[PDB]
Design a protein around this ligand. Structure first.
Ligand SMILES: [Zn+2]
Lengths: 50, 115, 59, 121
RNA sequence: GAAUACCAGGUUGAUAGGUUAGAAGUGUAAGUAUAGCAAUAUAUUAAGCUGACUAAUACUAAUUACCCGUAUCUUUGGCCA
RNA sequence: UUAAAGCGGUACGCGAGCUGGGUUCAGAACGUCGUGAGACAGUUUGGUCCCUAUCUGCCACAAGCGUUGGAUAUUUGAGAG
RNA sequence: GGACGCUGUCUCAACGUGGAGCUCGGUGAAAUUGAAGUAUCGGUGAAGAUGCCGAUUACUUGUGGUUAGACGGAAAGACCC
RNA sequence: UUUGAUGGAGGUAUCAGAAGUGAGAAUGCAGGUAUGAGUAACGAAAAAAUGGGUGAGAUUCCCAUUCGCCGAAAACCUAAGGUUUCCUGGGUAAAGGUCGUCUUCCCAGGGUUAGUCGGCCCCUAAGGCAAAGCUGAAAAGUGUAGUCGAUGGGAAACGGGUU
RNA sequence: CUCUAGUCUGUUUAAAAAGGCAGGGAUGAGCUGUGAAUAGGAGUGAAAGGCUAAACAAACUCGGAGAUAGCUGGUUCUCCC
RNA sequence: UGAAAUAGAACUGAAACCGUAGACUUACAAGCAGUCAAAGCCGUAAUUUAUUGCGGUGAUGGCGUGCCUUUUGCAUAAUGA
RNA sequence: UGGUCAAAGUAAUAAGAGUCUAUGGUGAAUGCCUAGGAGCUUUAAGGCGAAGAAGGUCGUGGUAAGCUGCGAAAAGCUUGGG
């Protein structure tokens, strides 16, 4: 059964990448929150996939 | 009670005590020759583990008591306790998972000079 | 199809002791080497059986 | 209750049982002595003794029958030339199956099958 | 006959297997020969082959084998002494 | 047709035995009522029947043990179907 | 809804084949679980008794089957309020 | 509160004060271990068998001979993805639904060579951003000139051999 | 290559929606790869109260929030009157 | 070696759980597993010594519907472990 | 009186299970301790960055896996004081 996570890469980087996060207000809030919490991974761009 | 000069102990052996105890019952109190023959014959994992421990116990007794041969020795006592457990996962339908315990046993054998 | 009450240790012990019971194999000392071998089987230690070689026992 | 006496079915469907018997008989004739499960060897000897008694007399027609079961040419020739001429006289019982004990691991009953008299070399 | 148990037998034995033979199934094999261009037919041929059964036959396998296993004692009656 | 085609109880016997036709979901249509949303033991069609048996109970086969010396056979019979 | 043909759907079941089930060896769960040296019948009772009264039956302990019960397990009933 | 075993380093009378001050249950929480139970399964009805070698240890490793299965594939070559899983050597705590000398397991070492391939690049589809202009409490929303955006369009290679 | 009437296995399954048999479409209201656009009182819907990351009569995450409950459950050592 | 190796990848190491050995009891019996009586066996102290106590097991007799929560009222087959 | 026999009581078995006594295994509760925390007081400091911040990637070790430090001059360098 084709299911929930057909894994593209251009979709991954475009929709959830660091530049897509910085591109708007809420994404920058996301980045600040994750920095404050001290996450080891900020965005999907830490998975080097292009 | 133990003459710990004459004994062997095997800790964390890869079998379940529930499966090793019957084989121990069949050789408790027998002569060494008869017990060794039984353990060699019977094709059970517990049988092989007991064979190693019993042979080691007899070896220790012989080494510390040079005038004791293979045919004055009888298996005086035999104890089989339970040892560490490891849990691994067996996945089933509908996302249900079950934990699948693996048991080990301790084995203690003491031999003694026959009547 | 599920146990209604946990059984007593007596019942569990009884069932376990009766079922998990293995029987000794019969024996008969080899005519050649004197080992105690399973009756009606080739000797595993010397290979003979009724004074006939059948195996070639290695290590 | 059980009907169909004469087999052990060797725990496998008919075609695979026939193939099993053919291969083990071939190997038995090739090697003069083999080890296997007691049931398998029992059926093997039931058929091997039959083949030997059929091959006691060497003719074209008999050879062409024995080919319907022995598909190794070398071993068919060996059976007709080297094996039977030593059992020309024996009224039966050319083989000998002797038990070996319970095998470690799955506790099968092993046994050894061999010829009573080794053939010509 | 589920593992059981019972029963039969264990070299002093036909218990099983093999083998021989028969009750029987298939219904005329392979090879060769004749006739036909060939297909095919006929003779060899109640053939060949298969024989879950039955009757024999120690040829092969059940070993020069291992564990369990008998009037406790008291009182009374009868017989014997 | 048969000599005769009885009346009741047992969770209107019996779904951890089976069947889902009906009853009693979400579809749709018809009749009627309500302004309408909808309602109607009015009608028609479609519409998952889960669970490896612990104990008791029952159908069968064994192990251990007793039956007062210990065993091997033949049987009288309570009782039961 | 009816007709023709065809059939193990049925009277009526039997046999055979394959995967499980059965025994042994290795590995090894689950839900449930106050425990248990837990018999039945007639009665009583939070009004359907394994636990009470009376009575009856029953050497001790397993295994393979089948679910009659333990108002079985699973889902703080979906129906009613 | 007294005597022992175990234990090897801090407790505590009297009086007075203060509480996270006393668990048997909440389909309680956390951890360990019974129970069912050595019972159901051990994952498709494509099928294995013999001999030999390695090894302490082989029905399950390796090699050889037969048999069986797929064969508009269960074959081969490239994407989408995975990221050392690839090769050589060594080893079996765990893990592999069993065993294991074996493995996509572990450890060490080694391994990916481009002018002609695929990208990068020069172009644009849908689309996104977008000075200016215009519109809105803010944050922005619309939107022109432009600029980005391939599954598209554009220069160049084939055969054979080697580890 | 795409779909699922009917039936069966499965339903503490191999699969949190398959598989074994079969059926419809099969040059078109066609299937499908690779990108992009529509986000929650909104979107989308050849229209069934469907779908929108396995759950939709108003998605999910965080915060208000320890929301409010005439409802249910639980509430731990002792003695005397 | 160390004060210690039932200090050897870990201090003190209980309960739940799994065992071994010894003593006693049990295979004619219907036990909320307890209490009140009680023969015999075993351990032990006194009394000159086999009858009284501290003890552990216990044939047999009498009595006895687990607990919690909730209800006019529960062993209840109401609830919860 | 001994033996045989008849009769009435009784001892001698535990495949297994139940209860004590002596012993262990499994398990990590209790006791004890702290390598890390929590709640505040008294001072000081309350910004950083286009002279490129905060926060990260990559790389730097005789040899490192991670962390930290550091920035191809890369677990450091120069000057001054201690
Ligand atoms: Zn020998």
């Amino acid at each position: 059964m084709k299911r929930t996570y057909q894994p593209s890469r251009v979709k991954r980087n475009r929709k959830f990448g660091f530049r897509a996060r910085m591109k708007t207000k809420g994404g920058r809030l996301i980045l600040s929150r994750r920095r404050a919490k001290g996450r080891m991974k900020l965005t999907v761009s830490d998975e080097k996939k292009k | 009670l133990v003459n710990r000069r004459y004994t062997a102990k095997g800790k964390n052996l890869p079998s379940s005590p529930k499966k090793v105890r019957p084989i121990a019952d069949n050789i408790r109190g027998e002569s060494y020759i008869k017990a060794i023959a039984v353990l060699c014959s019977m094709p059970n994992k517990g049988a092989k583990l007991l064979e190693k421990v019993v042979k080691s116990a007899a070896s220790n007794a012989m080494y510390h008591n040079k005038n004791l041969s293979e045919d004055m020795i009888f298996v005086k006592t035999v104890m089989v306790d339970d040892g560490r457990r490891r849990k691994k996962i067996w996945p089933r339908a509908r996302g249900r998972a079950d934990r699948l315990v693996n048991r080990n046993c301790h084995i203690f054998v003491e031999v003694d000079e026959k009547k | 199809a599920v146990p209604k009450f946990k059984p007593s240790k007596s019942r569990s012990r009884t069932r376990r002791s009766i079922n998990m019971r293995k029987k000794i194999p019969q024996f008969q000392e080899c005519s050649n080497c004197g080992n105690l071998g399973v009756r009606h089987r080739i000797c595993l230690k010397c290979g003979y059986y009724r004074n006939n070689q059948y195996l070639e026992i290695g290590l | 209750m059980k009907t169909k006496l004469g087999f052990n079915r060797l725990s496998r469907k008919s075609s695979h049982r026939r193939a099993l018997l053919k291969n083990m008989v071939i190997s038995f004739f090739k090697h003069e002595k083999i080890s296997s499960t007691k049931t398998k060897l029992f059926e093997v000897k039931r058929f091997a003794e039959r083949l030997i008694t059929r091959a006691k007399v060497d003719t074209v027609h008999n050879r062409r029958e024995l080919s319907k079961f022995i598909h190794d040419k070398h071993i068919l020739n060996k059976l007709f030339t080297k094996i039977s001429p030593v059992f020309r006289q024996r009224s039966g019982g050319y083989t000998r199956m002797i038990k070996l004990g319970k095998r470690y691991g799955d506790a099968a009953e092993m046994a050894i099958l061999e010829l009573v008299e080794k053939p010509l070399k």
